[PDB]
Amino acid sequence: KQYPIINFTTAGATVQSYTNFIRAVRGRLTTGADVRHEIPVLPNRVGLPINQRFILVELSNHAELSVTLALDVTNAYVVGYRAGNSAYFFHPDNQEDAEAITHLFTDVQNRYTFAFGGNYDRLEQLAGNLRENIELGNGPLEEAISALYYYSTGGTQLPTLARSFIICIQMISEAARFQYIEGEMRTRIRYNRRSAPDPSVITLENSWGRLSTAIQESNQGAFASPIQLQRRNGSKFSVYDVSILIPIIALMVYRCAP
């Protein structure tokens, strides 16, 4: 009757504490009973009961502020958030999703649905910057938490709210989806660095649906046609088999098997 909550703080964050956080997120996103070619699948949206539909990620910072994100277990998407007495949700893509989000944060005094949706393309337009120009790392996360916290009081400008959602989505949902992206965030934390995601990260994020489909329709792991990804330097290279992606992709959106 209460969605599971996973907590993380940027205060004193370490490689280990962030690893533990991502590990716990993945364990609440899916039971891992459905696995294809060794890669776990998230639950199928079709028929999933509303009491199993979301998980909550509570984020706190050194500035002593806390916000709670809500993630959809079917796709790990961030659907909205709460900060004390206000909660905000991206505009839903359909009436069923609009109904499902009514079961989030039910006791909050003030609820709002943004005019805009939450996909990267729309967020980047609102932010005035692409993912490739938005730094990630503990420093960015601590600032995003504060920016989300102050939004209900009028203190946070919309382009900074959208930048702050882009940071959270990549450092939580994308890291859950891809060990490679989790590793990129671990490296930033290890060296107290803040830097934008390189093309390898961006193209993996953009490819998640396509890779979920290609792995799940594969012939014993062999892709039906090669998929082009980007190296760190922006060069394209082909992948032909799920085997090379085992240490890279952690979760997939559901597809029916062949």
Crossing angle for the helix pair 120-127 and 158-168, to the nearest 10 degrees? 140
Q: Active site residue: 28, 177, 186, 188, which one?
A: 177
Task: Please work out the total of residues on this chain that contact ligand JP2, with binding judged by CB under 6 A.
Answer: 9
Binding part of the chain for ligand JP2, among 115-123, 127-135, 189-197, 246-254 by CB under 6 A, reads 115-123
Q: Of the two residues 138 and 173, which places its CB atom closer to ligand JP2 in the complex?
A: 173
**CB-based contact 206:174 (threshold 8 Å):** no
Binding pattern for the stretch 74-103 against ligand JP2, x by CB under 6 A and - elsewhere? --xxx-----------x-------------
Letter string b/e over residues 125-139, b meaning 16 or more CB atoms within 10 A of that residue's CB? ebbebebeebebbbb
Catalytic residue status for 88: no
Q: Coil, strand or helix: which one is 6?
A: strand
- Shortest approach of ligand JP2 to residue 243 CB, angstroms? 25
Q: Which residues pair with 60 in a beta bridge?
A: 9, 66
**CB-based contact 95:71 (threshold 8 Å):** no
- Shortest approach of ligand JP2 to residue 251 CB, angstroms? 11
Q: Active site residue: 45, 58, 77, 180, which one?
A: 77
What is the spatial distance between Cα 100 and Cα 169, in angstroms, rounded to a whole number?
Answer: 20
Does residue 173 belong to the site contacting ligand JP2 (CB under 6 A)? yes
| Residue carrying structure tokens 């998407």 | 77
Binding site for ligand JP2 (CB under 6 A): 76-78, 90, 118-120, 169, 173
Q: Which of the residues are catalytic? A: 77, 120, 174, 177
